[PDB]
Write a protein that binds this ligand. Structure first.
Ligand SMILES: O=c1ccn([C@@H]2O[C@H](COP(=O)(O)OP(=O)(O)O)[C@@H](O)[C@H]2O)c(=O)[nH]1
Ligand SMILES: O=c1ccn([C@@H]2O[C@H](COP(=O)(O)OP(=O)(O)O)[C@@H](O)[C@H]2O)c(=O)[nH]1
Ligand SMILES: [Fe+3]
Ligand SMILES: [Fe+3]
Ligand SMILES: [Fe+3]
Ligand SMILES: [Fe+3]
Lengths: 194, 194
């Protein structure tokens, strides 16, 4: 059960999250919970760890810049983090808010949440399931989601590659800064597109 | 004169380069020589250093992988370079072939050639002139070259930003690895698009 990892039931957590998140964002988390479970079954990841990490991944999406900055200092995180924003923070720093609020201590779950946005050069299968589930969950409808879905039905590694390529391409198209760890992910996985 | 920097006249160099490069690539170098001179006048860079670096930037474009690998060892370059190819090598490693063949010792010229493909987080005005001249030289006709040209008429820094964004966007679109120093350039310059 979820109480095996956190300080409340799934139902209690959902009530908590309905307070913290707009309806669309909660619906997203619910979709990721479901998609993570499906991927975990396909690729031999603990379905329960996957479901829970999937539900929790965007827990900290609505924290303010001020809160994240507090957390960086208190937890003595990489100082460079101040140069970034929500996109990087909600996973990389947001895991600390999760730990505080829910007493989550499992390192594998914490890590999968931590890098859900940016990835890493080395990712566990659980990290990959969450990274991909976020992108393919049933509520998403962005052009090309169908391709991501088909890829993910066959290969976790190629799904990570496709999503990361698309993200880098779009950030450059938009003229947004690219977190260097995103590029570590890109370069590690891009060969899977071949 | 060019003999102020290298071991032969401009005419002798052109004869040398006609041996080393296909006609299209030599025509490109000639275009970059011209474009570098124009940019240097606009942005207060030594026109002679700019012209010479512009002409020489793609000198080593046709070396074989084997030659570059020799040069990496002999000059004891970053070992990671072996993981890459021509695109990175022809500037980053190719500067050594230039030094050997032509007795080029000027550090500013050598540096502008070195990073003409990948840029750096910190670039001298000369580095920027070469980086941009390569992209806007009159023989180029890629869609959007007109925009690059207009930008470069106003701002060296914004031209670096636009070119780097386009390069990162296209590499991700194609599913090609991105040299980490390219991202250093991207993140340093991307703010200029605003
Ligand atoms: O290096 C970076 C910098 C920014 N973003 C952006 O972060 C946002 C949120 O990404 P996530 O995968 O966490 O999805 P969401 O929380 O919106 O479901 C997206 O708009 C990304 O383009 C990113 O993915 N990588
Ligand atoms: O991190 C990288 C990896 C590859 N390339 C590629 O290197 C090639 C040559 O770039 P350059 O600016 O040296 O132009 P050229 O020599 O073709 O005139 C282009 O196709 C680029 O997309 C790049 O610019 N950055
Ligand atoms: Fe997220
Ligand atoms: Fe999400
Ligand atoms: Fe080049
Ligand atoms: Fe060139």
């Amino acid at each position: 059960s979820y109480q095996d990892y956190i300080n409340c039931s799934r139902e209690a957590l959902l009530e908590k999250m309905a307070e913290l998140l707009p309806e669309k964002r909660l619906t997203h988390c619910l979709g990721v919970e479901r998609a993570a479970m499906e991927l975990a079954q396909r690729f031999g990841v603990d379905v329960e760890k996957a479901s829970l990490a999937g539900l929790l991944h965007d827990y900290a999406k609505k924290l303010s810049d001020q809160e994240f900055l507090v957390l960086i200092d208190r937890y003595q995180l990489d100082p460079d983090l101040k140069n970034w924003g929500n996109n990087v923070w909600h996973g990389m720093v947001g895991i600390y808010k999760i730990q505080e609020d829910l007493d989550l201590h499992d390192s594998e779950i914490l890590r999968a949440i931590e890098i859900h946005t940016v990835g890493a050069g080395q990712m566990t299968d659980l990290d990959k399931v969450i990274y991909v589930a976020d992108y393919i969950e049933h509520n998403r409808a962005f052009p090309g989601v169908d391709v991501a879905r088909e890829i993910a039905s066959l290969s976790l590694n190629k799904a990570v590659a496709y999503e990361t390529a698309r993200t880098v391409e779009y950030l450059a198209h938009q003229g947004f800064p690219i977190y260097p760890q995103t590029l570590e992910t890109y370069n590690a996985f891009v060969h899977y597109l071949k």
